[PDB]
Ligand SMILES: Cn1nc(C(C)(C)C)cc1NC(=O)Nc1ccc(Cl)cc1
């Protein structure tokens with residue numbers, strides 16, 4: 001074990017290896033640090049009360065398992081994870097180390113003037129990262145501009161901050177469908193993409209109902225084919241209950257957009273999530289011709305997430321998390 005030191009920042013104590021220097025608050029509780037081992041600047045996150053409830057303990061464990069697993073350019077990965085605790089008995093705090101990236105995409109959006117080439121490169125990187133995420137059988141479910149770190153050269157990493165967020169949510173997530181396929185995230189890529197083109201939010205709903213009213217205005221009310229898949233009572237029984245809305249043709253909404261951008265949007269923003277384009281399929285769309293490389297759009301190693309079914313005690317989830325701290329191997 002290295003030697004640690006204690007420092008107080010914004011009413012939060014922080015005990016970190018001497019390696020991590022220059023500490024200064026950024027945000028949960030995140031600091032910028034200077035990593036003297038690799039000469040680069042990092043974000044260090046100290047987890048708040050990680051083993052306080054069962055649910056906190058399980059989420060702490062999912063955090064670590066998940067970040068230990070993500071190893072892709074366009075997805076947040078773990079540079080390091082440490083605890084000041086010398087033993088399990090004494091184990092209480094968890095710090096995560098990741099790359100700091102300057103902005104999130106939210107900053108970059110409303111003040112900069114995005115070329116079609118900007119939208120290609122930014123959207124290409126989200127899909128690329130999503131292929132990877134989705135190949136591990138992970139659905140993000142809350143993809144938005146705040147959850148995309150962008151550096152100065154417009155390199156992009158997907159992440160989860162986590163806890164308006166509703167502006168990018170798939171219609172099915174917002175009616176609480178419970179059977180979600182991965183294309184929920186494709187819906188989110190559509191909303192983001194449209195906003196990078198127009199510079200404005202596609203569905204800036206004021207609340208839940210308004211959000212959905214705005215979605216249907218664009219995509220139209222459900223067709224016969226989609227309707228025939230709805231199991232439920234009055235889930236379907238309020239059919240045209242917000243008028244029998246005709247679907248907008250997107251060439252009319254995205255005037256002066258690359259017609260290939262328009263065509264991809266039509267394939268992302270389908271009501272019926274069985275008809276949505278996949279991440280891997282969207283990669284092969286002519287819109288990404290300048291960036292698409294078939295041999296450098298990698299998939300994930302098998303991700304064991306049996307643990308999610310498990311109902312364990314606070315102290316089992318704490319031990320499991322301890323094991324994960326102990327077993328961490330740093331990137332090259
Ligand atoms: C829970 N979670 N899920 C994902 C995805 C889906 C992108 C793999 C990523 C994460 N977790 C995070 O993104 N966590 C995280 C950790 C530290 C900082 Cl400074 C910022 C964010």
Ligand SMILES: CCCCCCCCO[C@@H]1O[C@H](CO)[C@@H](O)[C@H](O)[C@H]1O
Pocket residue numbers: 171172175177178179180181212222226229271272273274
């Ligand atoms: C506003 C009316 C709600 C329309 C949302 C329906 C689109 C969601 O997609 C639907 O739901 C499931 C995915 O969760 C799929 O398995 C279904 O087959 C699919 O059609």
